[PDB]
């Protein structure tokens, strides 16, 4: 590959495809791309004993194995027979928190690739990832890595292996059909959306490349006529000399079984066994003529060499990445329709709808990458429209930016451009559209999200929606320095690391604590390592973890919280009650949004929520930030009369509710499952006394009086631990879960290999080392993984001043709720004597 | 990656023997292809003008 040819192909056409991989716990990714780099960069030779990564440029992934830094790479891959294409592949880690990171980073790719283990098969990360990708409306191209782990490790026959693959594809297609009704992408076992890989042994090909091999050596026309029936349920008929999809003979297997798997196992058994005897007799028939010095290797590298000579240059995956993974000229429409805040009806929408390098520029930086000098970190981003050049200034923008809010803008000169390779970097002077560039000089004004427009002429430009994660981070940790005279360096490192890891979010509570919010234990571990080692060289102290809780109403309020305004001209009354859990999960799952007609919300409430007619028609407002489950309501006999004046002072009431839900009196945390119904609301005709000064805080007082005087109850999170392990480890996992507040959800003998997958919940309070405790007693055979996606109410009722956990015991009583209440109010600095029920009762 | 392996008993069994150890293959019942497939005319027009894969 010549860099000049790369530049020529860059500003050539939309043939350059954009892809982002997807996998879980080493199921096919960095070894596969190491094979790709060896195919493209021949001088970069892989080792003999140890595996070569080519994706963990940093050190933490090398020392742990679990990748953290998504290292995208772009390669000249002449894998299309008689053609060539450009591929922009975004490598991805596999861990759950890092899976949320990838899901945040999957906005860029027009399509998605999956690497599933041939033996382990489906996992939990994929169970979430399929749903996430279908929610983003991106392409899907399944692939299966670690196939040598099936033929060699298990020593299965062909038919059992093919049935295993059938079951894998059936489960994947069922999950996709449950996610949505994408008939175009669904049902893809043989159309080209199935790649094969043995990354450790470079055994990687597809149906098309297989048919191409046979047509090249001694064969017939291409796979358009042959590969259309190599899939099972159709055997070969040497009598008729064709594939008998009708009733076949007895001693016959599927064309996959006898054309592909037969010689596959043949050469595997000839290279592994009989390496001294059956090597040349089997290799001079179809293989290479490697010298005697080449046969003096161990079994693994020799096998990899033979697999590489067989699949000569891996001309199989470009044949599918161009097939179904669309070009950027095609994917610009839906990607922008889903990402851009406005619709396609905007001038900028139809402008950037095509990948015009000469037009309104709309860049978007997602992942921030550091350099050898920690004081300056670059930024990677997808150029959807326009053409960036060296030294061109751009209007960097923020997530809070808006057409009216011109505060989140800051100009900056693009210093030096690079190309993402993760081992080297190619400097660039001009960048066309559909491009990934390593931006320099823009490191300062960047936030977790980033959007770019032209510094002049790009006016009337909206921004891209803030990305989701599909995994709400619940962990809360404090990080205070060793010596207190090191605050600014620690905070600078904290900000740099925040810009590095988008999943987290800095915070400083009223108690003056330096707080961090992580998704998992290993997430916070890698974060603090990169902090103390890279972004801040100061010795820092660390506390223990704690889960960020929320409040909930156990039942209806007893009395009407009458929070009257201080002007003696506003008497608000809000009675709060809970709602169905599934409806709140759907409101959080973006099922029933707020921007709908009155009839639309009415039908949604009468069908989904099963609410009353006037009840649903009287919808007041939504929850905090229009994303959380906080239902506002306003219905009454005088409410139907004087709703106009109150409607004038309803915006301030909704704002006060949204700001009060952000921090409640229970534990200074969020609130959920609250249906605040406003019954009595005196509204004065004079807006001077009835202004905002007696709108926001009176409403906040009423809301807190209803939430505190209506049988409160906390809500602690529950993870979902899927531990693939044998039966003895199953009993051990039962013991540990019983000893740590567990709840056995599902446990079954997952086929394909002996790994009984134990699916069960763990609370975050008792999740401090679930993986460590499971791997300690199970003798290293129960590598489970957790994901926080289920919040449940603790059984305590922390209102009675009778239970007190004085000593350092772990609150075995059902006063554990009050224990966590006292602990949280002591950690937050607020008044630990939470007795505002009589103070906030507001008697009248 | 829990290293899976099938530790056989003695070297009298075949090489690739399904050890009754793991589970049923799929226990599938939704597949319904008792009747012949539609790719018949082009199938007859789709010969196999090449020697087999590894018959020898």
């Amino acid at each position: 590959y010549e860099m000049d040819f790369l530049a020529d192909l860059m500003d050539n056409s939309e043939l350059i495809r954009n892809v982002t991989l997807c996998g879980h716990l080493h199921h096919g990714k960095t070894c596969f791309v190491d094979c790709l780099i060896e195919q493209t960069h021949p001088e970069i030779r892989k080792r003999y004993d140890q595996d070569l990564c080519y994706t963990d440029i940093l050190f933490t992934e090398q020392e742990r194995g679990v990748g953290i830094k998504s290292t995208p790479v772009t390669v000249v891959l002449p894998d299309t027979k008689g053609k060539s294409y450009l591929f922009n592949i975004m490598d991805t880690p596999g861990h759950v928190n890092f899976s949320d990171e990838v899901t945040a980073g999957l906005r860029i790719s027009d399509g998605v690739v999956l690497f599933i283990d041939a033996a382990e098969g489906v996992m939990l990360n994929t169970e979430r990832l399929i749903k996430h990708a279908v929610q983003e409306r991106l392409a899907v191209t399944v692939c299966i890595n670690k196939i040598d782990r099936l033929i060699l490790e298990l020593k299965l026959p062909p038919t059992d292996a093919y049935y295993k693959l059938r079951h894998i594809v059936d489960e994947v297609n069922g999950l996709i059909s449950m996610y949505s009704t994408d008939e175009n992408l669904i049902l893809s076992p043989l159309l080209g959306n199935v790649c094969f890989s043995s990354s450790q042994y470079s055994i990687c090909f597809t149906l098309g490349s297989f048919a191409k091999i046979y047509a090249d050596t001694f064969g017939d026309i291409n796979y358009q006529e042959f590969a259309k029936r190599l899939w099972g349920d159709i055997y070969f008929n040497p009598k008729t000399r064709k594939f008998t999809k009708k009733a076949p003979t007895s001693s016959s297997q599927r064309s996959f079984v006898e054309f592909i798997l037969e010689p596959l196992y043949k050469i595997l058994a000839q290279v592994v066994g009989d390496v001294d005897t059956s090597l040349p007799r089997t290799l001079d028939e179809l293989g290479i003529h490697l010298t005697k010095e080449e046969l003096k290797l161990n079994i693994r590298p020799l096998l990899r060499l033979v697999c590489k000579k067989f699949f000569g240059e891996f001309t199989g995956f470009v044949d599918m990445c161009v097939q179904h993974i669309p070009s950027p000229k095609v994917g610009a429409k839906p990607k922008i329709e889903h990402t851009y805040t406005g619709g396609v009806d905007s001038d900028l929408g139809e402008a950037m709808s095509d990948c015009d390098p000469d037009g309104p520029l709309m860049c978007h930086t997602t992942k921030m990458y550091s350099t050898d000098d920690g004081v300056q970190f670059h930024a990677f981003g997808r150029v959807l429209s326009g053409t960036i050049h060296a030294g061109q200034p751009v209007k960097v923008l923020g997530e809070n930016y808006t057409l009216e809010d011109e505060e989140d803008s800051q100009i900056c000169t693009v210093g030096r451009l690079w190309i993402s390779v993760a081992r080297y970097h190619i400097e660039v002077n001009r960048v066309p559209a559909g491009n990934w560039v390593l931006i320099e000089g823009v490191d300062q004004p960047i936030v977790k999200t980033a959007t770019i427009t032209e510094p002049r002429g790009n006016e009337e430009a909206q921004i891209f929606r803030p990305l989701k994660f599909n995994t709400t981070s619940v962990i809360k940790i404090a990080v205070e320095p060793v010596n207190p005279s090191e605050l600014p360096k620690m905070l600078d490192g904290l900000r740099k690391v925040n810009k590095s890891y988008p999943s987290l979010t800095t915070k400083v509570e009223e108690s003056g604590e330096h707080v961090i919010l992580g998704t998992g234990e290993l997430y916070l571990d890698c974060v603090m390592h990169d902090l103390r080692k890279m972004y801040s060289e100061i010795d820092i102290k660390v506390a223990d973890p704690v889960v960020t809780f929320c409040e909930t109403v156990v039942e209806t309020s007893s009395l009407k919280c009458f929070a009257e305004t201080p002007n003696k001209k506003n008497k608000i009354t809000m009675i709060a009650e809970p709602l169905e859990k599934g409806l709140a999960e759907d409101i959080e799952n973006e099922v029933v949004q707020i921007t709908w007609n009155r009839k639309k919300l009415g039908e949604f409430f009468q069908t989904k929520y099963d609410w009353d007619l006037l009840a649903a028609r009287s919808i007041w407002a939504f929850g905090p930030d229009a994303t959380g489950p906080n239902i506002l309501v306003d219905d009454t006999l005088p409410s139907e009369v004087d709703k106009a004046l109150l409607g004038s002072v309803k915006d301030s009431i909704v704002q006060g509710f949204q700001w009060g839900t952000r921090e409640g009196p229970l534990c200074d945390e969020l609130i959920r499952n609250v249906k605040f119904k406003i019954l009595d609301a005196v509204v004065a005709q004079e807006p001077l006394h009835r202004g905002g000064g007696q709108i926001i805080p009176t409403a906040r007082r009423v809301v807190y009086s209803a939430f505190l005087m209506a049988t409160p109850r906390l809500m602690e999170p529950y993870y979902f631990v899927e531990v693939q392990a044998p039966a003895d480890c199953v009993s051990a996992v039962y013991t540990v879960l019983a000893r740590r507040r567990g709840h056995v959800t599902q446990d079954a003998p997952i086929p394909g290999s002996p790994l009984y997958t134990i699916k069960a919940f763990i609370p975050a309070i008792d999740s401090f080392g679930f993986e460590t405790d499971l791997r300690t007693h199970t003798q290293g055979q129960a590598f489970s993984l957790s994901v926080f996606h289920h919040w449940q109410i603790v059984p305590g009722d922390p209102l009675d001043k009778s239970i007190v956990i004085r000593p350092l015991e772990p609150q075995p009583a059902p006063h554990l709720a009050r224990e966590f209440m006292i602990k949280t109010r002591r950690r937050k600095g607020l008044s630990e004597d939470v007795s505002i029920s009589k103070f906030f009762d507001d008697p009248m | 990656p829990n290293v899976v392996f099938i530790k056989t008993e003695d070297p009298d069994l075949p090489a690739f023997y399904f050890d009754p150890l793991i589970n049923p293959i799929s226990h599938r019942h939704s597949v319904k292809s008792q009747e012949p497939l539609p790719d018949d005319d082009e199938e007859f027009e789709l010969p196999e003008f090449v020697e087999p894969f590894l018959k020898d």
């Binding site: 039966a727 | 056989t8 008993e9 003695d10 069994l13 050890d19 150890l21």
Partner: peptide
């Protein structure tokens, strides 16, 4: 040799079935 292989397969299948029955009884 073929009959020996079939008998060995039957014996290993019986042994694995007994072991799996014991393991499943313990797990239940």
């Amino acid at each position: 040799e073929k009959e020996l292989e079939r008998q060995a397969r039957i014996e290993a299948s019986l042994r694995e079935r007994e072991r799996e029955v014991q393991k499943a009884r313990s797990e239940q």
